Amino acid sequence: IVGGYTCGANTVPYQVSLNSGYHFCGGSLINSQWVVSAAHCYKSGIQVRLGEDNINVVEGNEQFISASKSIVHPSYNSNTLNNDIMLIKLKSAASLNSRVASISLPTSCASAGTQCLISGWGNTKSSGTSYPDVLKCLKAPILSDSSCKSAYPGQITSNMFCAGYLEGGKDSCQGDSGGPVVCSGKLQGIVSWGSGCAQKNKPGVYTKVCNYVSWIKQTIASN
Ligand SMILES: [Ca+2]
Ligand SMILES: [Cl-]
Ligand SMILES: [Cl-]
Structure with a gap:
């Protein structure tokens, strides 16, 4: 920003950080098991980080959960960035609360x-x-x-x-x-x-x- x-x-509380050893993309929690992000954010070895303010400090509201499944939009074009959307399902459901909310x-x-x-x-x-x-x-x-x-x-x-x-x-x-x-x-x-x-x-x-x-x-x- x-x-x-x-x-x-x-x-x-819907702001997620996508981590591959480092924050490389944002995402939005839309329910306990699913994140929406950019298709251009796609790679493997994604851990979703929820409850995050400082991504460099464990502050006490975090949930760390690996991606089980990533689904890039069927019509995503990487040259034009047309249909720049992707779904990531979590291995387990996050605990929803005031700080982690869809x-x-x-x-x-x-x-x-x-x-x-x-x-x-x-x-x-x-x-x-x-x-x-x-x-x-x-x-x-x-x-x-x-x-x-x-x-x-x-x-x-x-x-x-x-x-x-x-x-x-x-x-x-x-x-x-x-x-x-x-x-x-x-x-x-x-x-x-x-x-x-x-x-x-x-x-x-x-x-x-x-x-x-x-x-x-x-x-x-x-x-
Ligand atoms: Ca943190
Ligand atoms: Cl400020
Ligand atoms: Cl459809």
């Missing part, structure tokens, strides 16, 4: 202008590099389909939306990928891609989770 604020320990899936697509909360452990600098160990949050409006396409000609599909600020200074960044965009209690976005971070006229691009609910419910139902 660039231009963000320190969320507060466990204030984003986030609701959308029953409807959110609209441009809606305030959303973007979180993750990604880079905090638009130029240079610096990673935070505590979770960062950013409040961001969804931008119009048309201003998204203007910013990124030939690149935005019907499964993407932009959120943030055209003036720049405030964006998601490297290490935020797979992390949530929650809008009015509902998971509307996955941190997907962008041209640099927090650059003028280059906002964050997010997987449009409302397109994928059928797939998520049907997949959870049989796996």
Whole structure:
């Protein structure tokens, strides 16, 4: 997150860290056994870390559980990042509580202008590099389909939306990928891609989770 604020320990109870010896991606807990992340986050040897503020310190609310199964979207294209969504099932169900809680899936697509909360452990600098160990949050409006396409000609599909600020200074960044965009209690976005971070006229691009609910419910139902 660039231009963000320190969320507060466990204030984003659906925020997961995907670990392979190190945090490499975000994810969102959608029930006791299942995480939604970015398909571009896919690799093997994933441990899901829940109840996490400082990913470098054992602070006392963590649940560490290995991925049993990963399911990349059948139509995920790694070149275009179209359908940048993936499901990870846990070996065991997490204990849900105030600090580790599922986030609701959308029953409807959110609209441009809606305030959303973007979180993750990604880079905090638009130029240079610096990673935070505590979770960062950013409040961001969804931008119009048309201003998204203007910013990124030939690149935005019907499964993407932009959120943030055209003036720049405030964006998601490297290490935020797979992390949530929650809008009015509902998971509307996955941190997907962008041209640099927090650059003028280059906002964050997010997987449009409302397109994928059928797939998520049907997949959870049989796996
Ligand atoms: Ca920790
Ligand atoms: Cl702060
Ligand atoms: Cl389906």
